[PDB]
Design a protein around this ligand. Structure first.
Ligand SMILES: [Mg+2]
Ligand SMILES: [Mg+2]
Ligand SMILES: [Mg+2]
Ligand SMILES: [Mg+2]
Ligand SMILES: [Mg+2]
Ligand SMILES: [Mg+2]
Ligand SMILES: [Mg+2]
Ligand SMILES: [Mg+2]
Ligand SMILES: [Mg+2]
Ligand SMILES: [Mg+2]
Ligand SMILES: [Mg+2]
Ligand SMILES: [Mg+2]
Ligand SMILES: [Mg+2]
Ligand SMILES: [Mg+2]
Ligand SMILES: [Mg+2]
Ligand SMILES: [Mg+2]
Ligand SMILES: [Mg+2]
Ligand SMILES: [Mg+2]
Ligand SMILES: [Mg+2]
Ligand SMILES: [Mg+2]
Ligand SMILES: [Mg+2]
Ligand SMILES: [Mg+2]
Ligand SMILES: [Mg+2]
Ligand SMILES: [Mg+2]
Ligand SMILES: [Mg+2]
Ligand SMILES: [Mg+2]
Ligand SMILES: [Mg+2]
Ligand SMILES: [Mg+2]
Ligand SMILES: [Mg+2]
Ligand SMILES: [Mg+2]
Ligand SMILES: [Mg+2]
Ligand SMILES: [Mg+2]
Ligand SMILES: [Mg+2]
Ligand SMILES: [Mg+2]
Ligand SMILES: [Mg+2]
Ligand SMILES: [Mg+2]
Ligand SMILES: [Mg+2]
Ligand SMILES: [Mg+2]
Ligand SMILES: [Mg+2]
Ligand SMILES: [Mg+2]
Ligand SMILES: [Mg+2]
Ligand SMILES: [Mg+2]
Ligand SMILES: [Mg+2]
Ligand SMILES: [Mg+2]
Ligand SMILES: [Mg+2]
Ligand SMILES: [Mg+2]
Ligand SMILES: [Mg+2]
Ligand SMILES: [Mg+2]
Ligand SMILES: [Mg+2]
Ligand SMILES: [Mg+2]
Ligand SMILES: [Mg+2]
Ligand SMILES: [Mg+2]
Ligand SMILES: [Mg+2]
Ligand SMILES: [Mg+2]
Ligand SMILES: [Mg+2]
Ligand SMILES: [Mg+2]
Ligand SMILES: [Mg+2]
Ligand SMILES: [Mg+2]
Ligand SMILES: [Mg+2]
Ligand SMILES: [Mg+2]
Ligand SMILES: [Mg+2]
Ligand SMILES: [Mg+2]
Ligand SMILES: [Mg+2]
Ligand SMILES: [Mg+2]
Ligand SMILES: [Mg+2]
Ligand SMILES: [Mg+2]
Ligand SMILES: [Mg+2]
Ligand SMILES: [Mg+2]
Ligand SMILES: [Mg+2]
Ligand SMILES: [Mg+2]
Ligand SMILES: [Mg+2]
Ligand SMILES: [Mg+2]
Ligand SMILES: [Mg+2]
Lengths: 265, 134, 158
RNA sequence: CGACUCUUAGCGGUGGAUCACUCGGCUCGUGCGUCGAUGAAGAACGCAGCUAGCUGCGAGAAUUAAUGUGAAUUGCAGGACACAUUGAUCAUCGACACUUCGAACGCACUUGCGGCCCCGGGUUCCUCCCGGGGCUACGCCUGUCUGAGCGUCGCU
RNA sequence: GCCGUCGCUGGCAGUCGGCAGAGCGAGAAAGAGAGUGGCGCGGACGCUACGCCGCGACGAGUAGGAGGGCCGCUGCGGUGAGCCUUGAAGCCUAGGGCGCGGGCCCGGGUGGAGCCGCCGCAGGUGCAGAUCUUGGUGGUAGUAGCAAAUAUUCAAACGAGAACUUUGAAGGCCGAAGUGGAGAAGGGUUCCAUGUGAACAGCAGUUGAACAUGGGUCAGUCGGUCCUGAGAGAUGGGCGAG
RNA sequence: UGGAAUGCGAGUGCCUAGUGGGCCACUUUUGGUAAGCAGAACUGGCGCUGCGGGAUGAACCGAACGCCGGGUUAAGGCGCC
RNA sequence: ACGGACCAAGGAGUCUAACACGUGCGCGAGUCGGGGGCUACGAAAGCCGCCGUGGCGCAAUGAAGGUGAAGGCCGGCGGCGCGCCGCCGGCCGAGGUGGGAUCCCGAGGCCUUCCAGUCCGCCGAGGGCGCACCACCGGCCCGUCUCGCCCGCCGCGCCGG
RNA sequence: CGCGACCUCAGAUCAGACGUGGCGACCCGCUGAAUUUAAGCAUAUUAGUCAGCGGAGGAAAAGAAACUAACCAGGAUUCCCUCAGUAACGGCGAGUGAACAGGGAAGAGCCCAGCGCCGAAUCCCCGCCCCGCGGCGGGGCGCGGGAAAUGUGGCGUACGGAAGACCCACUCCCCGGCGCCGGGGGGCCCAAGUCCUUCUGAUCGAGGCCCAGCCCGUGGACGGUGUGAGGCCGGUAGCGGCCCCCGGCGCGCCGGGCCCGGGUCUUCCCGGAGUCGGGUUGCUUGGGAAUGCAGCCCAAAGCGGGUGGUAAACUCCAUCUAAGGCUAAAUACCGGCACGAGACCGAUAGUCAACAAGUACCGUAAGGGAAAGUUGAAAAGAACUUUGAAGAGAGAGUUCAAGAGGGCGUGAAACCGUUAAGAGGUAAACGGGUGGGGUCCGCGCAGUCCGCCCGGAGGAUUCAACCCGGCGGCGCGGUCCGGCCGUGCCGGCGGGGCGGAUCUCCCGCUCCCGUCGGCGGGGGACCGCCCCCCGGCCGGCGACCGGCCGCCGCCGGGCGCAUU
């Protein structure tokens, strides 16, 4: 409150009365009279630099950089190592990316959704979300944030015909529309490699949404994939190639440690 | 998950509306499950506990198969008093121990005109729901 | 005090500017409120075009913009007169009228006259009493095909 | 020797830090956007079986009626020929009610003085006395009635 | 000898293995070159390359600048199939240790319901001071003091308890401009009876104007009420943005 | 025959805090009787800096500082402390 | 010299705006949707493209009226007298000097029984193309000053170049 | 003298109405500082801001040009973006500072006086009848009263309007009643474990619940309940259900009003004054030889007047039409009612106020204004005995715990009591180096472990080699087949999408005589790129593999039966 600490008429006694010069509360007859006021060192005073509502809470991010992030999150979602390193139990999902026929877009019952995750071997990720459900340390409990859990798979669909109502009650699941992808859901915490399940219709729109290298995006007015700064990243293969190996000088892998100086005399 | 914009999941608000609930709301809050036999007979799961109901304690020090009559519904303290669920004070006078209605099971229902009307409504809404899915 | 090279700045913060800071946290709510009012207005006036009445073509003033035409306020009385539309009737069939505007040249006059005649061709007109069709009312066959037009009516382009 | 003193540790005090809790705040957002002479806001004084404050209410005073609900309220007692269509309690709230002051209005602000009309009891029509009720404030609009003017006139 | 910094913008992708052959530190440029004619199945470690290794020099510091913190506090997104009533946070500890240090870990006790590690994000984020704020506690200290207005003593009663209460008797004082008997203003129940002796009455109290439970103010004639006083104050009128 | 000796890797650009009270000593030096006075030049110091000696000491003499072992020294010392 | 008897908790470079430079990321002579619109977390995110209006950048200069960013050679003609100006048509063409990481060429040379001469590499005097950057010298655009001879025409001008 | 009209002005407790006061977050009208900055200060700034006064409403105010402009022109008001920290103002210092255009939100336009024509065609009120009556109205009847010619009503208002003539076209538009049919408030309800072991004071904890995976799940928000709960209860979900009330929207009947328009000609009519404008003063603005406002003086015109950002004369142009009025929306909202949420604070924090807080208490008054949360799961709140006058104790008892005993969770430091150990004449304390003594720790006390080999004793799910089967790695298989496939290159009558400031038979509107020319609307061709089909070369399969053949490795089963 902009008034906190200032709803008083405190006045400094000045010097000469053997007390600090902080403004003091007026009148008498109560504990409050003659006490420090206003200053941020005082009990019941005004905090230093009171917080304002016009703090800059919101950040503009360029559209091109946002799309870059969506492209890097999807690329990192097709690599088992990155999905594994995100803690997802995908040790038995048959393939990555995991594409499932469009029938699921018409699921209605939560039991169909659970049965599909079990036959895709995506149920161990859910059981891992059930294990992580616990209470949150700290004041967040007092502020409607008592329960914490980890994220499960992300299901990406083209059209919703009950799939959202089918899956929304399974903890850890997130439903995403292929044409409205979010980096806050694809890369929770800023770390790439969320396990994603794709419907066939959603998987077929990706080229149009983000364009190939040869063909620009069709559903984005003017966009194409970000170019690679390094076409071949297999550094070990590059260094062991005969071309590079022919230009190398012989390695010097002999250690010449310090010699103890003995007096010749 | 809750989607109603006009229902608060705020912890402070929910607790306040629990501990400041008016008497006719505390009645609904003070509801007990029916025994398995009663549930099959009436198709109802829960009833607001009432005086002269016979219940089983299923949690706490006094749990057990003994069936006693409800002798007082102290809605202010959110507890009910049951026959023989009692202890002695220092001076030896016996005192009832309060049990929350959600920790008992209703084995016999005190039935009158209104209680039968309430049971019928609950069984009817359940049937509409069961056929709605079917 | 100035320190080495720099710009001389004169910030306009010598008043009680904190007393009059307009934050914009109600912006998403405003956008939802306006959208909810557009949809409720489109339903109310359906099948009439949601965008509103048809607007005339006009040339932007000054030499910075006179190369561009845009949507005006309303059709001039001369344009309505040349197209044979009564100025009081015009608004009742979704035509915007501007009694203030003049027509200095014939070309702009005729461009808007053609605009009106074209609009009068696409206008589906319902009978006042559905059971009693009248002289000008559109035929029953073309009424069942009437739909609410979204976006400005006959959009203006350069 | 032992006092006294210092240090460290156990235990005990003094104190109320810390931690955990939160029916409170604060901030943002949304819908609505409603006082009063038909007496508002505010104030005073009262009202409970036991009740000081808070709360609620107004001499019908921790409330009446009606509607919904359906067996309590409760700290103790009590049960009206209180309690299941003879409806406990709570909630709602459209009926009825709502003391004194207060724009506050008969005049004044001490519960001081009146005035007009009607009713009732005193005795015994009228008077007189007591009580009850209703009116008696400023400004202002329309209209009504009663008037004023060596104001402008007309007939006498 | 060890620690760190700086420098060599130093070395290591060559772990090239039985599809093998072990080197490139050596004073003095450039190839351990290619070819054409005249029995056993074996061989340490390494390499979070933001990593690892070597060699040499160096190291004071206020004001001030910079870097690095696996230093510390609170909350958010991720993660730890993390911890926890078989005991969380907190707190105490002549217990065992770690780190140059900021600090941290483990043992034991108490406690009773939550909490922490890592990658990021965020900040009302680190106290010895400000005659700092608020709260608490010391020494001083069982100390200064409980000394203005002449004064008490004897016996008994109640009582657990008597210098201080009550009664009786002495000795004193105020000495009618009183320490007497009544009022105004102010107080507001302090008045009266009974009870208590927790707190208060700067010792004590069997006592109190304290606390507790109940009572008590009766009018034609005594005041207000009425009059006007100095004065205050409406209406008419004037002024006035109001 | 990179045209004296010696030593040493240099050039360059942005942004920039604190400071803007100083004071002391050899030599030189103005005013003043002089001052632990006031004012200058040069270098070096204290301020910002510990350490050995001067018993003690901002500045003197020696010497500058990571945590250690051995050895040797400086300026100073070696009756006893 | 001043504050500090003691203990606990609290206690002081923050937030908004503007600017400067440095750094990181995106795109790039462009870039940016911030305002608007479309389509529980979510007030998020996604999209717009005839929503890029608009900002900043892409052009400077002058008070302003305003103007507004290389030339050389060949052939022919008119004028003045091999040289100069103007007009035509064809060729080439964004400067030069010094330094300059890097790159390129290569006199000769890098051994094993001895000669000839090959294929791959490798060092190297000397010699070239010369990045960025710096110094210097020229050029071009706008203002202004001096000098001076011409060229254009729907307006023959106190015109324009 | 009297009587009677009108005018002007009075009195009524006359009949019926209306204003007052409050709240004030936002809004309109006034009035209006000084701290402050200028490193002083006076103009300036602060600031048209605080304070002061008045008036409102759900919004207010504004608002349909006496506008902007100078363009090929726009076209009420308000708000957002930008214009723009710009034109401009300024001890030209400090500082201040708009508008137009452009893009959006929203969008709505109108009415008088006047000039005229209609027999005042107009209005209020009283009485009676019908209807309706908690928004007092509709119809009818009164030689009922009044207002009003010192001007009410209808037509009509700058976009022009009116009357007449002529052609053309017209029956639904509204008011008051009565009846029938398809969003809002309230109430009541609607899934599934208290299953089997077990921890606990109690548990919502742990483990289990056949293939499969306890059960529900459009419900795994939250809260409660003796931890920690989707399934115990309330709820949550749901285009779920039932019941009331209100509203909105259609359809008929009755009694009323209106007797309604377009074009072309003829003739007519047309506007707001102590206002504009000018001088001067004061304030105000970015407005500068004066932006706006106000006082005083002067004081208009009618082809006039106003504006046209440098004073003035002359002259062309442009653009409006002042001095009367109404008007939703987009906009604002720290007050009010009712809600939802949060990277916020967490009892010295957060509002002063988590609690009998604007309370207690202080001040004559205006005003000033705190402190203060926590037993326990449950009061089970300690009966009874005993000492004491009592306060207090000792036993006993409740509880998981009183080592939680009514200001009771935890229970720090300072300070103090006692106990234990050590010590003590240069105040204490402190750095370095040892030594002595304790507290405890090593859960020490005949002292490591590992590999190979030698030897003695034993015991085997017994070794190699071969056979069968599975899997795997690699293959330059010098060049095996098949596949996908090239961000490769070539030939396609290839079947297409996107783009183009590359070219061009059909139509809509439009100028001119039934023709011919112009705008806009579409094919087509062409070029660039991409996708998909087909054929050939080279190519990958190390971000992208199968079948066969070979080699090798591993595993399972045989056989090996013992100098391994
Ligand atoms: Mg505070
Ligand atoms: Mg914590
Ligand atoms: Mg500075
Ligand atoms: Mg002790
Ligand atoms: Mg009372
Ligand atoms: Mg009632
Ligand atoms: Mg009832
Ligand atoms: Mg009086
Ligand atoms: Mg250093
Ligand atoms: Mg200690
Ligand atoms: Mg607890
Ligand atoms: Mg914080
Ligand atoms: Mg402190
Ligand atoms: Mg003494
Ligand atoms: Mg005394
Ligand atoms: Mg007396
Ligand atoms: Mg007396
Ligand atoms: Mg005493
Ligand atoms: Mg007394
Ligand atoms: Mg007066
Ligand atoms: Mg000197
Ligand atoms: Mg200093
Ligand atoms: Mg120095
Ligand atoms: Mg030194
Ligand atoms: Mg000496
Ligand atoms: Mg030494
Ligand atoms: Mg001082
Ligand atoms: Mg002091
Ligand atoms: Mg602190
Ligand atoms: Mg930058
Ligand atoms: Mg939200
Ligand atoms: Mg009256
Ligand atoms: Mg100043
Ligand atoms: Mg100053
Ligand atoms: Mg001053
Ligand atoms: Mg001003
Ligand atoms: Mg004000
Ligand atoms: Mg007011
Ligand atoms: Mg008012
Ligand atoms: Mg109102
Ligand atoms: Mg407008
Ligand atoms: Mg700009
Ligand atoms: Mg100046
Ligand atoms: Mg200003
Ligand atoms: Mg504009
Ligand atoms: Mg719009
Ligand atoms: Mg008229
Ligand atoms: Mg007009
Ligand atoms: Mg349920
Ligand atoms: Mg729970
Ligand atoms: Mg279980
Ligand atoms: Mg739960
Ligand atoms: Mg379960
Ligand atoms: Mg339910
Ligand atoms: Mg529901
Ligand atoms: Mg007008
Ligand atoms: Mg005017
Ligand atoms: Mg002024
Ligand atoms: Mg001004
Ligand atoms: Mg001019
Ligand atoms: Mg208005
Ligand atoms: Mg507190
Ligand atoms: Mg507080
Ligand atoms: Mg405290
Ligand atoms: Mg705290
Ligand atoms: Mg407090
Ligand atoms: Mg506490
Ligand atoms: Mg507790
Ligand atoms: Mg305990
Ligand atoms: Mg405890
Ligand atoms: Mg406590
Ligand atoms: Mg305690
Ligand atoms: Mg001792």
């Amino acid at each position: 409150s902009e008034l906190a600490g200032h709803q008083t008429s405190a006045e400094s006694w000045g010097t000469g009365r053997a007390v600090a010069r902080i403004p003091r509360v007026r009148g008498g007859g109560t504990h409050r009279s003659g006490q420090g006021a206003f200053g941020n060192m005082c009990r019941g005073g005004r905090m230093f630099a009171p917080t304002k509502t016009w703090r800059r809470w919101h950040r503009r991010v360029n559209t091109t950089q946002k799309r870059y992030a969506i492209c890097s999150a999807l690329a990192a979602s097709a690599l088992p190592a990155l999905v594994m390193s995100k803690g997802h139990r995908i040790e038995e999902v048959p393939e990555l990316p995991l594409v499932v026929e469009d029938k699921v877009e018409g699921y209605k019952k939560t039991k169909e959704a659970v049965l599909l995750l079990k036959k895709l071997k995506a149920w161990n990720d859910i059981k891992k979300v059930y294990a992580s459900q616990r209470m949150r340390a700290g004041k967040g409990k007092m502020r409607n944030r008592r329960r914490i859990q980890r994220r499960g798979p992300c299901v990406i669909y083209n059209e919703d015909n009950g799939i959202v109502k089918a899956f929304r009650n399974i903890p850890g699941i997130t439903l995403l529309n292929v044409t409205k992808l979010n980096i806050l859901k694809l890369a929770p915490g800023g770390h790439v490699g969320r396990f994603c399940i794709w419907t066939e219709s959603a998987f077929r729109k990706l080229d149009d949404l983000y364009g190939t290298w040869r063909k620009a995006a069709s559903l984005k007015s003017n966009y194409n994939l970000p170019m690679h700064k390094m076409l071949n990243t297999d550094l070990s293969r590059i260094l062991k190639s005969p071309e590079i190996q022919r230009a190398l000088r012989a390695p010097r892998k002999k250690i010449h440690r310090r010699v103890l100086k003995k007096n010749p005399l | 998950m809750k989607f109603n914009p006009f229902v608060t999941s705020d912890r402070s608000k929910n607790r306040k509306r629990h501990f400041n609930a008016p008497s006719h709301i505390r009645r609904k809050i003070m509801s007990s499950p029916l025994s398995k036999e009663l549930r099959q007979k009436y198709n109802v799961r829960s009833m607001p506990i009432r005086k002269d109901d016979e219940v089983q304690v299923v949690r706490g020090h006094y749990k057990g198969q003994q069936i006693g009559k409800v002798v007082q519904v102290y809605r202010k303290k959110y507890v009910i008093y049951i026959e023989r669920v009692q202890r002695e004070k220092a001076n030896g006078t016996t005192v009832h121990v309060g049990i929350h209605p959600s920790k008992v099971v209703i084995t016999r229902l005190k039935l009158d005109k209104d209680r039968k009307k309430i049971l019928e409504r609950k069984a009817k809404s359940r049937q509409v729901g069961k056929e709605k899915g079917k | 005090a100035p320190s080495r090279n720099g710009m001389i700045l004169k910030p306009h913060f010598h008043k009680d500017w904190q007393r009059r800071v307009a934050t914009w946290f109600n912006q998403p709510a405003r956008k939802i409120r306006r959208r909810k009012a557009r949809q409720a207005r489109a339903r109310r006036i359906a099948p009439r075009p949601a965008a509103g009445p048809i607007r005339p073509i006009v040339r932007c003033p000054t030499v910075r913009y006179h190369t561009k035409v845009r949507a005006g306020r309303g059709f001039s009385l001369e344009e309505l007169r040349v197209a044979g539309i009564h100025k009081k009737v015009a608004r009742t069939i979704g035509i915007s009228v501007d009694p203030r505007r003049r027509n200095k040249s014939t070309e702009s006059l005729q461009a808007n006259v053609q605009r009106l005649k074209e609009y009068r061709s696409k206008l589906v007109l319902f009978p006042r009493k559905p059971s009693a069709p009248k002289k000008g009312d559109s035929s029953a066959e073309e009424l069942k095909l009437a739909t609410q037009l979204t976006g400005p009516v006959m959009p203006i382009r350069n």
